[PDB]
């Protein structure tokens, strides 16, 4: 529940929240069965996926050690089977 700013415009949702110095701006789209550009390469973005994904992994590991917490958090099945969301 530490956040600062919210922006929205024609492209999705820009959430902005800070951690201890370095400060976060990021994005979520508006969900549709909207197709892929069918050109641009994933491979570059797939390895951005490998490394950056790992970053995210430990960052949330060492990040659940902030207080003390079980990394990654357990989920209840009914949650996802029904909701499948941040709930």
């Amino acid at each position: 529940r530490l956040v600062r700013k919210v922006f929205v415009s024609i492209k999705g949702v820009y959430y902005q929240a800070n951690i201890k110095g370095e400060e976060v701006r990021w994005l979520v789209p508006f969900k549709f069965p909207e197709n892929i550009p069918s050109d641009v390469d994933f491979r570059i973005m797939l390895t951005f996926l490998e490394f950056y994904s790992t970053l995210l992994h430990f960052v949330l590991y060492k990040l659940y050690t902030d207080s003390g917490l079980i990394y990654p958090p357990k989920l209840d099945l009914k949650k996802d089977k029904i909701i499948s969301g941040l709930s």
């Binding site: 956040v3 600062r4 700013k5 919210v6 922006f7 929205v8 415009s9 902005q16």
Partner: peptide, 27 residues
């Protein structure tokens, strides 16, 4: 805009369908 201030804007600018602040970007 609830968090663009921290005010909890009253329902006068709200309570649809009356106009709401159009966007008011953080920047």
């Amino acid at each position: 805009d609830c968090i663009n201030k921290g005010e909890l804007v009253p329902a006068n600018k709200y309570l649809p369908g009356e106009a709401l602040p159009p966007h008011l970007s953080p920047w």
